């Protein structure tokens, strides 16, 4: 239910204190791949120690430099090789350098109020990690992820994707009010994603993610975006996405569906909305700032 690191990556941990991951020495790449039975995050949060230096964190105090560096890493990932599922609440603060969060964790993962300091950008996945060098894939074949009430706050990312099998949106997904607003990607179904270039190619699974017209995306009215762009994109052919929670971008709305897409409101301050299914394709009132609106099923 907590951190239970695997080979060079320790915990420091005990009581009251707030939990601070000495992640292991990046390759060549710049990649820090950490390896944990469990991996499980709590309110406050959690510290990634990506320091030469000795300092203090916010959310966590004093800390000393992570004994494993012989330099700080521009991608942390962490990922759960054992059979129980992740919950994240609270803040991923990255100590030192900033760079990109990826957490990975087949078995699901439940995200309930998460929040992030001095993360470049994060990533959300069910998916196995193959990690070559700086060139990470992410081969997704089950999984949920579940983004709970208390809702995902993403002010100071370039983007939040979220790569699952299926995704369950049931808080909102934003950035603050007048804050920089942070990319929201969330891509479902049988896909090997390329964390280098956030593209999604279907691939073969053991398994379908779910029956015909059942949805790999699906958000409630609780389910609310704001993002810079928001796209959502769902691979496997049958399946939907539903998302009645109300989308809002300056810039625009893309979403993708092998399947069925329902929206609800969906608004782009200045640039184009655009819906791309395979089934059929609704939404409830579509508008754009500057006119760029487009329905295809």
């Known amino acids: 239910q907590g951190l239970v690191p695997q080979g060079q990556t320790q915990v ?14 990046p390759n060549s790449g710049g990649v820090s791949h950490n390896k944990f039975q469990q991996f499980n995050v709590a309110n406050p949060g959690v510290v990634f120690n990506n320091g030469l230096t000795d300092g203090v964190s916010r959310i966590g105090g004093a800390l000393t430099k992570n004994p494993n560096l012989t330099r700080q890493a521009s991608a942390i990932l962490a990922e759960v090789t054992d059979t129980s599922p992740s919950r994240l609440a609270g803040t991923l603060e990255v100590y030192g350098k900033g760079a990109d969060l990826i957490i990975a964790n087949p ?14 950008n994060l990533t959300l996945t069910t998916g196995r990690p193959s990690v070559n060098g700086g060139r990470i894939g992410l081969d997704v074949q089950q999984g949920t992820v579940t983004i709970e009430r208390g809702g995902v706050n993403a002010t100071g990312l370039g983007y ?8 369950k949106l049931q808080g909102a997904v934003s950035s603050k009010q007048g804050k920089p607003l942070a990319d929201i990607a969330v891509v ?7 964390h280098a270039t956030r593209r999604a190619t279907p691939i073969a699974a053991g398994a379908r993610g779910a029956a015909a017209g059942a949805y790999a995306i699906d958000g409630t009215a609780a389910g609310a975006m704001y993002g810079k ?6 691979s496997d052919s049958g399946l ?4 009645l929670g109300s989308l809002s971008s300056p810039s625009a709305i893309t979403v993708s569906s092998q399947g069925e897409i329902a929206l609800g409101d969906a608004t782009v301050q200045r640039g184009p ?8 394709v609704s939404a409830g009132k579509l508008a754009s700032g500057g006119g760029a609106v487009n329905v295809a099923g």
């Open 229 to 234: 762009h928001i796209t959502l994109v769902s």
């Open 107 to 120: 078995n699901g993962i439940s995200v309930n109020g998460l929040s992030t300091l001095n993360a470049s």
């Open 160 to 167: 939040f994707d979220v790569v699952a099998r299926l995704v």
């Open 273 to 280: 909305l655009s819906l791309k299914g395979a089934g059929v």
């Open 240 to 243: 939907g996405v539903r998302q």
């Open 12 to 25: 420091l941990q005990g009581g009251n204190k707030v939990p601070v991951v000495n992640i292991a020495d």
């Open 188 to 194: 479902a179904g049988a896909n090997r994603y390329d």
